[PDB]
Structure 1
């Protein structure tokens, strides 16, 4: 049909590759995924069309709310007797005159009550036929949440700013909602464990080789038996035809067993050349048999062993690579993995107070803390009591002998009825350590039952990452993520972008490509806006690449002239004008203010772009939006660091210490190509010093910052600015120490006109003292009550963050999958286990941090 073809073209533009390439993939799992994934799209669409137009309006404009309605003590105290002052705006007449109405109302009021009191205050001079929009952006208060629970409202209460909302007729918004029509695509319409034998595989021959073959059987990262080296054969004739036998009975193979192979050379000096991984069982539970051709992958940098087990599974798309031919035993009939019923049958067939408290203390430990064989057998002998302390499930799982079908079946049974645990603890069961499908299903159930969409957006990147650890295209994790992304556009935006930002990686090009196909097919009208964003980023990448490639070594003004010339090309202006900000899709970006765009030139010619805000009430939020488009350096590290900083600020706020951090927006959109939010009214310390040097030929003294702030904050604003600086500074001190952020200096740090301090450009982390300039110490006031409160702040924040070491360590263990340089093995993560003194006690870690900050 016509709709099908147009949708195919748009989806191909959005994903990068055309839809027709997926059809030519003669892979049963690929077509089966493309077809079976559509049930999730159908569920999402039905949930959208369920409750008439309000359901769609909620799908497109979901509430940006905190997970808990309860306010911290200090946040509530900032309220006027538990109430908040709110300005509600109304546009009247065709001229659209803006009339404000100020109200003082209970912080826990529903938007309906707010609208009611607003109409009351307005008539002193309906029937719920209105809704509340945020003045200056496309965020809506469509749900009966308590106002204070909306992130915007809680932010206004924390910042002392006053919330400005616009009253808007509901019909005016529903008229702006397209009648979406998701069209179903055109591509939709035995022996068991009886084998009882040892596993053996024939390595046949290898092509495209320019030595021996090392192989092993693994369950996730652990080997189910010893590795087997084949006969060292000359590279001229890469023909082994050898048979490799392993110390593993065939039915003893767990469900997620994997064959990991690589080709090594010798000088003495063993060196890998090309690696590969194969699923012993396919997506239909069938045990693979017969001949099989696997194209290998190039080696990643800094590989310790001669094998890459943690690497993706599947044949290299580029078939012009090393190709290894293999042979698997073929028995009576097609072998399948047993049904859960046979598992339960074979499982049924197959205690002191001090010991229970020992189990509890074990569960308390952090993930990276190793467990001993004695402790493993101890947890296993007490596997049933561990159900009472559920958060020990990760270590219990780690204590299993996955090469024994008996223990595997009994653990399956224990999982089928295992109690649910917190999402922060359920994510630990999804990294590379736990490839078992039942464990991952339990974790996905925990997430589905106990994860708010706020917390989902807060951890969306880690989940998109752990997607790579999935044994098969079709699994419960991807279906959960896809349902949420197709029922919540705020989540689907960063879902799509986290996926697309890695389409360049042929390791996951297939998986993410198919997932993006399904999403774009079911996402609705937002595909047009995503396409406009993609074309804008395309033009920006073109301009940045061309800039350096052809004009790199010109002067600032000549590069500026060329940038103004090419940026004015109509095919370019149309592309970069009138679209949604990928950093925050609620932000419209209208026409470019070219007079305000420039090339920073600090590193790799970053672009500083400036758009007008076309919002009807842009002036009440910001009339201009600024973004740094950087094509050059990797921003994934920055994304993760800013996420962790936001989480630390959330912890501190919910624990009762107001250390205002600044986790500004940062989004990697492609191979080292990304965007960065621009914090208004912010300058680097080096900028302050240069502006305050007061001498063309003289150096720059430190005592300038306090003077600059006092100038920018005169009167009663002075103490407030000093407090803001001190608190934000203590927060960032503790953050940078714990995370081991790279070299700080006078331009890595920034301050705002009201005193807030923050950091930028997190080059390398996890590889130790703060700058603590005489500037900072003079702003705080060495021997004053101010510094006493400062040290108290720092110690309290260090303890608060030490209390969530499990969460932070799990976040890093999940990000391990992404090919980030400063994060390649658990050894890099151990730096946090160091700086937080996990193996020490509370008082011990307190003394440790005191001494570390004394230096």
Structure 2
């Protein structure tokens, strides 16, 4: 199984400098050899064979090369160490010992299976021992997607391979909003093309003024025209020279591995649009196509070793559903206090029950035996395809009921077969805080931990193997059900109002029947499909069959709208397939990367391992390495979770089998992260009581060791694979003064023109805190900026990078030239004041932007401040303070640390719910009003309020998208987002049960109250105490 600790030996974080390794020779002898913890297996084998000649049977020892080492790893696996360049510490041994053996089997196949297993977290042989035919059918059948994805990469190669490795980092639309177009000099952009001339890197620049919408090949054409401008070529000769060589070069971003390889307008590339808004000069580097294509290796996709009766329709069986509960093996309960136990059962279609729940008779705790046939209030033909049995063993103790162990089963298996015969089910433990007697939202399947309460079951048999009907049968039955509407002016107006309602709105039973009765008129307004589907009686064969036909011929919808149909509320395979079809045809690679967090989460709701969503996401992962990179990390980050280890493990294995050479790069990142996890685990556990100076001494000593220097240098940044992390600047590395003591790392940018982007790349590694909440908040902030910017509202956010890479382990991107509001306050004078001067922030910003650039900095502060005020209000980010708000030297205000704003939402013991009030400090209004004393009434404040009103309504217009993005996250193990009630607060702030004008007035009321609430209270800044 996956390793429980990143230690170099079992229960030992670090090996001592020298260690005694028991070497088991091939002649039969046993030699204890002293080795350095950083010694390579090449050195250890050479030293072992020198000492082996001293011991007996030395005549039977062949050459060192003829043998290979073997040992038990901490994953309880017999690993054959093919790569002999590996260090003893990096081998992950269970105990210090190595057997020398004659190598066997296909060496090249075994090397790849080690590399796949290392990146996954678990060994590949674990999947071979799984006897579930669905698990082996997934492994075999999913390779059809992998082979199709690899065939696309070698369709128009080497350009197809180059596009896979370096996808064009572009925005979804080439239309530049008016505020972005107005920043161009008469629609034109001034760019700088660089070329390397001499081997010692003698550079040459070419400043060009070109139209913003020039495709990269037209940029190359203008560079060719400038270089061949004084070569006596006629207007015809030059035109034919330009047209011949424009396709022989490609542009690259100076400082990083981002290439302009596709025919998109230059401005559609995110780097160029960023340069336009920031007013920066784009620095691109020109190079020959063969210079990049020679660097790309053609890694072939070898097929693995694992790649090699009557049936009655469900609707024929006219009978009531019956399930017999035989007995449970045991139950962790005390015979005193608890009187009896029973098995509560229910048939569900997602969270909604299809019928009244049915319990077994109560039996004594010591003898869990029922042998009772339970009859459910639904007939077998009326079972929808996603019908599931949800059960649990409960206790009794007015009368109180409590769940003890829960479990769910798919009533139809992956081959459409209805469950039949006897079957055992190892039950799962009750989650913390779940008081519900059943867990329908919980994982569907038997607990892999077989040392758990096992409940035997029995499903009825019907002479033949019962299978769910074909689409041909369902289509014919739907036409029969219609043979066994009206409309009015109010009906069309009511349908349009219901489609615009947010997903969380309350749909009444009259509205449900109204939508179902006018279901054929609904096709004219396709955005109402989610509301109509909730109105379908899913426990009715006739309504479901008719819905299937409407879904079959339903027109497509926006991907943002189709995403809702993948959350917990829509479990039907026909609805989910419809949603995937919309994403296949309409979701761009920009939006797929944008919403990949949720799309990976909704994979957990799928009933079966092989399905249309996973086949879609794995295809985009294997045909776009930017999508593939985060697809790997979002799945790898949850491999510790035994609930999803097998699902995500099988998926990651299929990804790694065909991702190509990128598996080598991901292993480098995994190695580097394993070392940082182990290093920080020592500081977090044994060396926790030691001083900051003492911990830093240890940190330097360990980071300098060769094993650490090799592992932590020359690898791609997991936060952005376009950034390479070269040599580590050890003098710049430090333990930060923050929660969980995160580690600040610094690397040189090994790019040839690093100087034109960033010389050093800094990342904060944090071990202890759950970063999913920060990741999701930062994603929402990026999506809000994206809405505002697309609408033409220039509000600048800073959604810095954040990536969770394990169980409460992650990376945070460092923003260069930024400081907290308290760091600004302390940097600028102070003199022990207790009350910080409110004008200090304005003065600091004035000094950083003197002269002409002053007005620009104030505008950027106003635009960034306005949107963070709106974002923090809509999301209820009330935990804001002078140490978790930062301002860049250029004036950009942005917020950091979003893991703690929901800690005090709970309300228990009459705390009024702690409503998040809208607030804006006087310090910021002084910056916005350019140092005015009466800052609450200036023309700059007037514009600022107007910025917030427009931005607030722009988010309220797309309220359904934010509700859908959070609704998809409910299935994730995040304790902050479990039920739709945790999202309900966004409806209070966005005022969704009001008109747009009423919501604008509501927001204006909360913003005008914030002026009164921004009280300059006479209290010290350290402890906050009033006289």
- Tell me if TM exceeds 0.5: yes
C-alpha contact (below 8 Å) 1:544/1:605 kept by paired residues: no
The residue correspondences of 1:60-99 to structure 2 (distance < 5 A) are: 60-99=165-204
Q: Distance in 1 between matches of 2:623 and 2:947?
A: 41
What is the distance in 2 between the residues matched to 1:764 and 1:249?
48
CA gap 1:120/1:469 in 2 versus in 1, 3 angstroms: same
Q: Tell me how far 1:375 sits from its aligned partner.
A: 0.7
User: Does the aligned pair in 1 maintain the 2:443–2:643 contact within 8 Å?
Assistant: yes
On the 8 A contact 1:744/1:771 being kept in 2, the answer is: no
Shift of 1:336: 0.3
Q: Distance in 1 between matches of 2:949 and 2:900?
A: 25
Structure 1 position 821, deviation (Å): 2.0
Q: Deviations over 1:388-423 (max 9, x none)?
A: 100100000000101111111111111111000000
TM norm structure 1: 0.98
Give the deviation of 1:764 after TM superposition: 3.8
Whole-Å Cα distance in 2 between the matches of residues 502 and 322 of structure 1? Answer: 25
Segment drifting more, 199-208 vs 496-505: 199-208
Asked whether the equivalents of residues 314 and 380 of structure 2 are also in contact (C-alpha less than 8 Å), the reply is no
Q: TM-score, normalised by structure 2?
A: 0.82
The answer to whether structure 1 residue 12 and structure 2 residue 112 are counterparts is no
RMSD (Å) for aligned C-alpha atoms: 1.5
Cα distance in 2 between the residues matched to 1:611 and 1:661 = 26
Deviations 1:569-627 (A, max 9, x none): 21111111110000000000011101000000311110100000000100000010000
Distance 1:778 1:287, change over 3 A: same
Answer whether contact 1:742 1:764 (CA < 8 A) is retained. no
Three-state SS of the structure 2 residue aligned to 1:586 is: coil
**2:232 alignment partner in structure 1:** none
Please, which moves more after superposition, 683-692 or 101-110? Answer: 683-692
Mapped to 2, the partners of 1:608 and 1:505 lie a distance apart of: 27
CA distance in 1, matches of 2:547, 2:741: 55
| CA deviation profile, 1:809-847 (whole Å, cap 9, x unmatched) | 000000111111221110110100111011100111011
Task: For residues 431-474 of structure 1, give each alpha carbon's deviation from its aligned partner in whole angstroms, at most 9, with x where no partner exists.
Answer: 00111000000000000011100010010110000000001001
The match for 2:466 among 335, 352, 375 is: 335
Per the alignment, residue 362 of structure 1 pairs with 498
Quick one: distance in 2 between partners of 1:127 and 1:529? 32
How far does residue 338 in structure 1 lie from its aligned partner after superposition? 0.4
Could you tell me how far apart the structure 1 residues matched to 2:629 and 2:892 are? 30
CA shift, 1:765, in A, is 4.6
Distance in 1 of aligned mates of 2:517 and 2:445? 37
What is the rounded CA distance, in whole Å, between the counterparts of 1:639 and 1:127 in structure 2?
41
Which moved further from structure 2: 183-192 or 828-837?
A: 183-192
Q: CA deviation at 1:268?
A: 2.0
Change (3 A) 1:192 1:825: closer
Contact 1:692/1:700 (<8 A) preserved: no
How many Å separate the matches in 2 of 1:228 and 1:306?
A: 12
Superposed displacement of residue 88, structure 1: 0.4
Spell out, residue by residue over 1:639-694, the C-alpha distance to the aligned partner (whole angstroms, 9 max, x if none): 11111111111111111111111011111111111100000000000111122243
Contact 1:693–1:701 (CA under 8 A) maintained in structure 2: no
In the aligned structure 1, how far is the partner of 2:740 from the partner of 2:322?
53
In 2, Cα distance between the equivalents of 1:547 and 1:495?
Answer: 30
Assess if the C-alpha contact under 8 Å between 1:486 and 1:523 holds in 2.
yes
Distance 1:518 1:660, change over 3 A: same
Q: Structure 1 stretch 764-773 or stretch 598-607: which is displaced more?
A: 764-773
CA contact (8 A) 1:637 1:763 kept: yes
Matched residue SS, 1:484: helix
Mean alpha-carbon deviation: is it higher for 740-749 or for 347-356?
A: 347-356
Distance 1:39 1:719 in 2: 58
Correspondent of 1:627 among 752, 760, 763? 763
How many angstroms apart in 1 are the aligned matches of 2:729 and 2:222? 40
Deviation readout 1:489-521 (Å, 9 max, x if unpaired)? 000000010000001111111110000000000
Q: Is the 8 A contact 1:745 1:771 kept in 2?
A: no
SS at match of 1:826: coil
Deviation at 1:773, TM superposition (A): 1.4
Equivalent of residue 748 in structure 2, options 612, 615, 618? 612
Using the alignment, how far apart are the partners of 1:650 and 1:756 within structure 2? Answer: 17
- The range that moved more, 88-97 or 116-125, is 116-125
- Matched position secondary structure for 2:305: coil
Please name the residue that 1:498 is paired with. 634
Q: Which moved more, 1:431-440 or 1:552-561?
A: 552-561
CA contact (8 A) 2:220 2:246 kept: no
Alpha-carbon distance in structure 2 between the residues aligned to 1:111 and 1:722: 35
Distance across 1 between alignment mates of 2:291 and 2:362 = 75
Separation of aligned partners in 2, 1:177 and 1:797: 45
How far residue 191 of structure 1 moved from its aligned partner, in angstroms, is 4.2
Superposed displacement of residue 697, structure 1? 7.1
Could you tell me how far apart the structure 1 residues matched to 2:199 and 2:611 are?
53
Contact 1:741–1:763, Cα closer than 8 Å, also in 2 = no
In structure 2, relative to structure 1, the CA distance for the partners of 1:810 and 1:765 (3 Å cut) is farther
- What is residue 580 of structure 2 aligned with on the other side? 444
Question: Contact conserved, 1:387 with 1:418, CA < 8 A, in 2?
Answer: yes
Q: Could you say what secondary structure the match of 1:562 adopts?
A: helix
**Residues 221-240 of structure 1 mapped to structure 2, 5 A cutoff:** 221-240=351-370
Match of residue 198 from structure 1: 320
Residue aligning to 1:829: 983
- Report if aligned partners of 1:201, 1:244 keep a CA contact under 8 Å in 2: yes
**Following TM superposition, by how much is the alpha carbon of 1:568 offset from its aligned partner in structure 2, in angstroms?**
1.4
Matched residue of 1:828: which SS?
coil
Tell me how far apart the structure 2 counterparts of residues 850 and 21 of structure 1 sit (CA, whole Å).
60
Give the CA deviation at 1:127.
4.9
Q: CA deviation at 1:770?
A: 4.0
Structure 2: 5+ residue stretches without partners: 1-105, 230-243, 331-339, 483-487, 904-915, 930-935, 1009-1027
Find the residue that maps to 1:719 and give its secondary structure: helix
Cα shift at 1:742:
4.0
Alpha-carbon shift at residue 702 of structure 1 (Å): 2.5
| Whole-angstrom CA distance in 1 between matches of 2:403 and 2:823 | 49
Structural mapping, 1:276-295, within 5 Å:
276-295=407-426
